[PDB]
């Protein structure tokens, strides 16, 4: 999809294998913000998006938190607390064509600004001078879009397919995880558990705390877990720390 109408399909309820993406070499830029591209296989996200688009000409590096320009301010703006990865690679041999695939729009001018992670397909005529023009491209009223131009003659101006994976790992019970083979759970022993990304060490016991059908884990006064609803059985286990003390 063109950058002014970037696609996005929310990925969930599946096993995410970021190994098949991290080791591939065709990707030109693989930059991750808030996460490391080598530790994506051991994490569990509540929802992972995939914003795919094509950005040729300049602004190949404007897809990043805290950047300005004609693309990052009028087409696709990322937040400042962005958590995810930004993958890019020039697709000159798929999105070029023998003549010109003038098929990608980029939305010049827009109005005054654009909020993060917002999209707008409205093609209403933009007026920079006087107001009178209503849906008519007049003297000082331009059609807002303006298409892209693709040809080898233009490296710093050839299309770069971009896929912006945006992970949100605090919004819900973790539904998309990495390729980690589950093991049997053992109770009454100090173990280093891993409940879909919830890493930690402790001794798991049976509990009497009657979880409600929607609650998935209990929490302490601090940001430490007290009880967990174990997957694959929906059982409520208590996490007590295995004994310690001075000597």
């Amino acid at each position: 999809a063109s950058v002014y109408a970037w696609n996005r399909k929310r990925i969930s309820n599946c096993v995410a294998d970021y190994s098949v993406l991290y080791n591939s070499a065709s990707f030109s830029t693989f930059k991750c913000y808030g996460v490391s591209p080598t530790k994506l296989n051991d994490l569990c996200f509540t929802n992972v998006y995939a914003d795919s688009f094509v950005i040729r000409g300049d602004e190949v590096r404007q897809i990043a938190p805290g950047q300005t320009g004609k693309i990052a301010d009028y087409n696709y703006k990322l937040p400042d607390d962005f958590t995810g990865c930004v993958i890019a690679w020039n697709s000159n041999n798929l999105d070029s064509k023998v003549g010109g695939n003038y098929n990608y729009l980029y939305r010049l001018f827009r109005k005054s600004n654009l909020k993060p992670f917002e999209r707008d397909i409205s093609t209403e005529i933009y007026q920079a001078g006087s107001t009178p023009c209503n849906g008519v491209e007049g003297f000082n009223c331009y059609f807002p879009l303006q298409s892209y131009g693709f040809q080898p003659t233009n490296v710093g101006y050839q299309p770069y397919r971009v896929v912006v994976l945006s992970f949100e790992l605090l919004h819900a019970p973790a539904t998309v995880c990495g390729p980690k083979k589950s093991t049997n759970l053992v109770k009454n022993k100090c173990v280093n558990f891993n409940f879909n990304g919830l890493t930690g060490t402790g001794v798991l016991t049976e509990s009497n705390k009657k979880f409600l059908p929607f609650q998935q884990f209990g929490r302490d006064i601090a940001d430490t877990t007290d009880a967990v609803r174990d997957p694959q059985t929906l059982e409520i286990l208590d996490i007590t720390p295995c004994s310690f003390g001075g000597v």
Epitope: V20, S24, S26, W89
Partner: antibody, heavy 129, light 108 residues
Framework: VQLVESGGGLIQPGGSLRLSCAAS????????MSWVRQAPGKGLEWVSV???????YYADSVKGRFTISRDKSKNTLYLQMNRLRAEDTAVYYC?????????????????????????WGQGTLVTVS | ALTQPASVSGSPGQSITISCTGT?????????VSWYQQHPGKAPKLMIY???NRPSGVSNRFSGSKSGNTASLTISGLQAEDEADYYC??????????FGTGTKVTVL
Amino acid sequence: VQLVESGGGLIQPGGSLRLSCAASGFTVSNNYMSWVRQAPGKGLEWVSVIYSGGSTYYADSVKGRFTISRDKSKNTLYLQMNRLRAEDTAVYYCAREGEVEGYNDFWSGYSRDRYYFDYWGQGTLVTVS
Amino acid sequence: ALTQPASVSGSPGQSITISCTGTSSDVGGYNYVSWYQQHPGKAPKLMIYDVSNRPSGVSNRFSGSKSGNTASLTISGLQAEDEADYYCSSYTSSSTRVFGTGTKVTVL
């Protein structure tokens, strides 16, 4: 990428012939190199293949008679033909295999396999009589 | 070895399928079936590789597939230039490569 061949011609049965395939734009060690012949007006028969290093693999019709070699310094591919026979009359092509990550597939990274044939040589006539 | 129909024929505009039956070792076992096009007096040209994919720079009408021990080259929209023989080269099954007998296509 260029592949030029030389060395073929008229020869008697039982003799010896060494073929040449000079490769510019790539090496005899970057990607797998293979020899393939085509009898006059007939199909294609794979003769032999040398891997990027340490392979002397041939066909059952040419085992013990042909040996494939290369010179890294001159960047040429060689094919010794000893004890030629009348059924070896064909035009011989030196075929470079697929470079790693050919056509830039982004799903399979750098696994060499990519077993196919990239651009070929021009071919030289070998007439055993 | 690999068996192919000695010749196929068709009219411009429609599609033609090309078969190549082999054993379960290379075509039925492995997945590196390829296809080539050789005009008389020219060196062959890579038409299909990976037995699903197609090399860039080639007309998109070409298409390939394999059902078990049988490979298939499904050319669509025949033109006048398509007149040439097509060889199906599967994987080798331990480095003894194989080729088909060849299918000389004739366009009406």
